[PDB]
């Protein structure tokens, strides 16, 4: 069964430089990560950093998650990630995306022992 940490790492956790793809990295990569299969996920971000840089963050700048939970953290350092977000024609199942490359930081929810990334909340 899928955990939490294994459905973030799935969901977000591109490690590279920066995004490269053949052709539209959203479309390839929300698809491929099957972001795409029970709903058009209608916005995901990808991170290119090592996934001990993303664990990290966890002991880093605590902040207020969107939904009010306190367990959320902003990464101190900008991280290279890319926005996923569904365009206007994007029906289900014909999910398309614009792809927005940026350097920000980082904010993820952590939960569990060990404490690891579990939810992508913001970058700012
Ligand atoms: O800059 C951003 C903003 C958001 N995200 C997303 O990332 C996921 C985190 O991972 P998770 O494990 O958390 O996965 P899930 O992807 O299942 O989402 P959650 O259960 O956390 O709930 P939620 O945040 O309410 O999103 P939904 O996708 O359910 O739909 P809505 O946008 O509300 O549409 P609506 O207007 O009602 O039709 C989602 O929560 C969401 O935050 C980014 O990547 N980057």
């Known amino acids: 069964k899928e955990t939490a940490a294994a459905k973030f790492e799935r ?3 591109d490690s590279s430089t920066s ?3 053949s052709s539209n990295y959203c479309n390839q990569m929300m698809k491929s990560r099957n972001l795409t299969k029970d709903r058009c996920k209608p916005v995901n971000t990808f991170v290119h950093e090592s996934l001990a840089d993303v ?3 966890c002991s880093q700048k605590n902040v207020a998650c969107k939904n009010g939970q ?3 953290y902003q990464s101190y350092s900008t991280m290279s ?3 996923c977000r569904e365009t206007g024609s994007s029906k289900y199942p014909n999910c398309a995306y614009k792809t927005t490359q940026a ?8 939960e569990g022992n060990p404490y ?3 939810h992508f909340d913001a970058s700012v």
């Open 55 to 57: 664990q990290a963050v």
């Open 116 to 118: 690891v990334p579990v």
């Open 103 to 110: 350097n920000k930081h980082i904010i993820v929810a952590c």
């Open 11 to 13: 969901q977000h956790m």
């Open 70 to 72: 306190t367990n959320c």
């Open 19 to 21: 995004a490269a793809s």
């Open 81 to 83: 990630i890319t926005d």
